[PDB]
């Protein structure tokens, strides 16, 4: 699925090896790895299909980053450091905890200074694989001059050529990520174009097209975990999510100089290879190209997902209580569209 | 359920008798029979609960109408005469036959002159209970002067006191109905206030509150039979409509001088008593009182029905094909709000 490991330059041996990939209950096809000059790449990006561009130098200067360097050249600054009790990082939207008062969060986020992060990070590495941390921070923290330089060294010309050539809109977000081995962010989906610039370490990426909605079972729109598959990929419950047995995604392993496009609405599942050491990556999120007023039929999968999403929110308003959403949809269907 | 027959004045014997009522698989409570001067009646009408007003004289002059009289005093005029092959009259909205191309209609409507109606009507009565006819025509056909007089004799003062005192809007429709024994119009619902002025013969009326939606299973909004229960009351299919076993309605038998209020959205099922001869009745349909901009929660059942109705139509637009409605609702629910 992820293909045979790539060989490191200067006979340094296979980049990674199969034992470092976690086990899953489904097939996968490889995402094509190409050059930014290859016409087929611009194509795939235009038909909103994932690609792995290998020579964009988007993050060239950052390829030298590492803990030591980073702590040494970054200002005090606050760094959101997410922590989990296992490999699965269970992120959640606080603003929606009211709607599901019995939802107990399993991913604390603590603000701390970079060095403090490195500390706890090493601690775990000496006592043991207890928690797993994940520092996610934006690239606007006036950080060490050294860093700002590197941030400037990024290939903006290129990435911008995209933002315009593709017709997308504003760059919604830009985060820096440093994780440990085995870190996994369960499958989920954004409604924005994605570019993941791998830097240090290798990351396994698994994507499912929006049309795989019926097999992934997102949480209810009003649920803290909205946009995330409810299926434990480590132990699917085919009794509740039977169509998970029909899921099929594209996968690939990204290394230091690679940039993976993740078309909006797609489902991505990210995991830092086991025994692969720490991983550093910077991600970019561009708001999508404004939708055409002329809607052609039939609709693309994401257009439906849009529809579904809205109707749910719509009933949230109407009924004045997101809990009643379910019961309504059911009476509306049972015996009628069953 | 419908109570013991009322005794006819002047020792003419019980009005009707139990053997004339069809058999059904569910319990029923009686609708209260009151006087228009009774405060409780205005109450029930205000809380949109059905009542049977017995002394409104709404249709006093018409109580003399009968075939002979009617044919004799009504202009040529065209009279929609619906015909069925059995007791169940299967009405349908033509404008929605495109959406269900495999829908085969079982209720022809033929335009004809009153006398022609009486003819065919008697024919059936001599050869036999083959078809069952049902003449439904508006009260604006410039008909025989004799009739116009009677139409004027109606108690407009009263009925208007309602249209205003209740806050309702325009009188949407006003039809005249003449049916034969055993005629049944399967349960269904209007979104308008109803007043049924019985004239000749006796009619059995069965109503279910809007909150009985989950037990009645209306057809899909885009279906020719939209607004009608899909359940054959003569042979329910508890396998597909299990909640029909929880249905419970109010019932009553209307005779010559009675007027039954049928609050908007409610479900009514009408049948002309077996061996009761022909039935004549004039019905009034008033558009409801404009909805308050201030919506109190939780919502009344009909408010939900409104919601559901809309969402269906909404998906009809969006997906550009009422057929896809079902499949969408299901993927949206399966594994999510199941």
Swiss-Prot record, chains A, B:
<dbReference type="InterPro" id="IPR003347">
    <property type="entry name" value="JmjC_dom"/>
</dbReference>
<feature type="binding site">
    <location>
        <position position="310"/>
    </location>
    <ligand>
        <name>substrate</name>
    </ligand>
</feature>
<protein>
    <recommendedName>
        <fullName>Hypoxia-inducible factor 1-alpha inhibitor</fullName>
        <ecNumber>1.14.11.30</ecNumber>
        <ecNumber>1.14.11.n4</ecNumber>
    </recommendedName>
</protein>
<feature type="binding site">
    <location>
        <position position="190"/>
    </location>
    <ligand>
        <name>Fe cation</name>
    </ligand>
</feature>
<keyword id="KW-0479">Metal-binding</keyword>
<dbReference type="GO" id="GO:0008198">
    <property type="term" value="F:ferrous iron binding"/>
</dbReference>
<keyword id="KW-0560">Oxidoreductase</keyword>
<feature type="binding site">
    <location>
        <position position="185"/>
    </location>
    <ligand>
        <name>2-oxoglutarate</name>
    </ligand>
</feature>
<dbReference type="GO" id="GO:0036140">
    <property type="term" value="F:[protein]-asparagine 3-dioxygenase activity"/>
</dbReference>
<keyword id="KW-0805">Transcription regulation</keyword>
<feature type="binding site">
    <location>
        <position position="289"/>
    </location>
    <ligand>
        <name>substrate</name>
    </ligand>
</feature>
<dbReference type="GO" id="GO:0030947">
    <property type="term" value="P:regulation of vascular endothelial growth factor receptor signaling pathway"/>
</dbReference>
<feature type="region of interest" description="Interaction with VHL">
    <location>
        <begin position="1"/>
        <end position="114"/>
    </location>
</feature>
<feature type="binding site">
    <location>
        <begin position="227"/>
        <end position="228"/>
    </location>
    <ligand>
        <name>substrate</name>
    </ligand>
</feature>
<feature type="binding site">
    <location>
        <position position="141"/>
    </location>
    <ligand>
        <name>substrate</name>
    </ligand>
</feature>
<feature type="domain" description="JmjC">
    <location>
        <begin position="131"/>
        <end position="301"/>
    </location>
</feature>
<feature type="binding site">
    <location>
        <position position="188"/>
    </location>
    <ligand>
        <name>Fe cation</name>
    </ligand>
</feature>
<dbReference type="GO" id="GO:0062101">
    <property type="term" value="F:peptidyl-aspartic acid 3-dioxygenase activity"/>
</dbReference>
<dbReference type="InterPro" id="IPR027452">
    <property type="entry name" value="FIH-1_dom_II"/>
</dbReference>
<comment type="subunit">
    <text>Homodimer; homodimerization is essential for catalytic activity. Interacts with VHL and HIF1A. Part of a complex with VHL, HIF1A and HDAC1 or HDAC2 or HDAC3. Interacts with NFKB1 and NFKBIA. Interacts with NOTCH1, NOTCH2 and NOTCH3 but not with NOTCH4. Interacts with APBA3; binding inhibits HIF1AN binding to HIF1A. Interacts with TNKS2. Interacts with PPP1R12A. Interacts with ASB4. Interacts with UBE3A. Interacts with ANKS3. Interacts with NECAB3; the interaction is indirect and seems to be mediated by APBA3.</text>
</comment>
<dbReference type="GO" id="GO:0005737">
    <property type="term" value="C:cytoplasm"/>
</dbReference>
<dbReference type="GO" id="GO:0036139">
    <property type="term" value="F:peptidyl-histidine dioxygenase activity"/>
</dbReference>
<feature type="binding site">
    <location>
        <position position="283"/>
    </location>
    <ligand>
        <name>2-oxoglutarate</name>
    </ligand>
</feature>
<feature type="region of interest" description="Disordered">
    <location>
        <begin position="1"/>
        <end position="40"/>
    </location>
</feature>
<dbReference type="GO" id="GO:0008270">
    <property type="term" value="F:zinc ion binding"/>
</dbReference>
<keyword id="KW-0963">Cytoplasm</keyword>
<dbReference type="GO" id="GO:0061629">
    <property type="term" value="F:RNA polymerase II-specific DNA-binding transcription factor binding"/>
</dbReference>
<feature type="binding site">
    <location>
        <position position="203"/>
    </location>
    <ligand>
        <name>2-oxoglutarate</name>
    </ligand>
</feature>
<feature type="site" description="Important for dimer formation">
    <location>
        <position position="329"/>
    </location>
</feature>
<dbReference type="GO" id="GO:0045746">
    <property type="term" value="P:negative regulation of Notch signaling pathway"/>
</dbReference>
<keyword id="KW-0007">Acetylation</keyword>
<keyword id="KW-0223">Dioxygenase</keyword>
<dbReference type="InterPro" id="IPR041667">
    <property type="entry name" value="Cupin_8"/>
</dbReference>
<dbReference type="Pfam" id="PF13621">
    <property type="entry name" value="Cupin_8"/>
</dbReference>
<feature type="binding site">
    <location>
        <position position="134"/>
    </location>
    <ligand>
        <name>2-oxoglutarate</name>
    </ligand>
</feature>
<dbReference type="GO" id="GO:0019826">
    <property type="term" value="F:oxygen sensor activity"/>
</dbReference>
<dbReference type="GO" id="GO:0048471">
    <property type="term" value="C:perinuclear region of cytoplasm"/>
</dbReference>
<dbReference type="GO" id="GO:0000122">
    <property type="term" value="P:negative regulation of transcription by RNA polymerase II"/>
</dbReference>
<dbReference type="GO" id="GO:0051059">
    <property type="term" value="F:NF-kappaB binding"/>
</dbReference>
<dbReference type="GO" id="GO:2001214">
    <property type="term" value="P:positive regulation of vasculogenesis"/>
</dbReference>
<feature type="binding site">
    <location>
        <begin position="190"/>
        <end position="192"/>
    </location>
    <ligand>
        <name>substrate</name>
    </ligand>
</feature>
<feature type="binding site">
    <location>
        <position position="268"/>
    </location>
    <ligand>
        <name>Fe cation</name>
    </ligand>
</feature>
């Amino acid at each position: 699925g992820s293909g045979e490991p790539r060989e490191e330059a200067g006979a340094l041996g296979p980049a990674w090896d199969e034992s470092q990939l976690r086990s899953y209950s489904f097939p996968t096809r490889p995402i094509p790895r190409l050059s930014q000059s290859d016409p087929r790449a611009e194509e795939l990006i235009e038909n909103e299909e994932p690609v792995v561009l290998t020579d964009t130098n988007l993050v060239y200067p950052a390829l030298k980053w590492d803990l030591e360097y980073l702590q040494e050249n970054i200002g005090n600054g606050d760094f959101s450091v997410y922590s989990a009790s296992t490999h699965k990082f269970l992120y959640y939207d606080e603003k929606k905890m009211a709607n599901f008062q019995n939802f107990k969060p399993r991913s604390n986020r603590e603000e701390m200074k970079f060095h403090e992060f490195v500390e706890k990070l090493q601690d775990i590495q000496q006592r043991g694989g207890e928690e797993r941390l994940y520092l996610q921070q934006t690239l606007n923290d006036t950080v060490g001059g050294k860093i700002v330089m590197d941030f400037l060294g990024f290939n903006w010309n290129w990435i911008n050529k995209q933002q315009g050539k593709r017709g997308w809109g504003q760059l919604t977000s830009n985060l820096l990520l440093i994780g440990m081995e085995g870190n996994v962010t369960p499958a989920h989906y954004d409604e924005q174009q994605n570019f993941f610039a791998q830097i240090k370490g290798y990351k396994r990426c698994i994507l499912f097209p929006p049309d795989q909605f019926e097999c992934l079972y997102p949480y209810p729109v009003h649920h803290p975990c909205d946009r995330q598959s409810q299926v434990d990929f480590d132990n699917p419950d085919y009794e509740r999510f039977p169509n998970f047995q029909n899921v099929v995604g594209y996968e690939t392993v990204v290394g230091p100089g690679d940039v993976l496009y993740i078309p909006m609405y797609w489902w991505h599942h990210i995991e830092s290879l086991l025994n692969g050491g720490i991983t550093i990556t910077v991600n970019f999120w561009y708001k999508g190209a404004p939708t055409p007023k002329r809607i052609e039929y039939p609709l693309k999968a994401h257009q439906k997902v849009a529809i579904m999403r809205n109707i749910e929110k719509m009933l949230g308003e109407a009924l004045g209580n997101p809990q009643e959403v379910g019961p309504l949809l059911n009476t509306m269907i049972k015996g009628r569209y069953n």
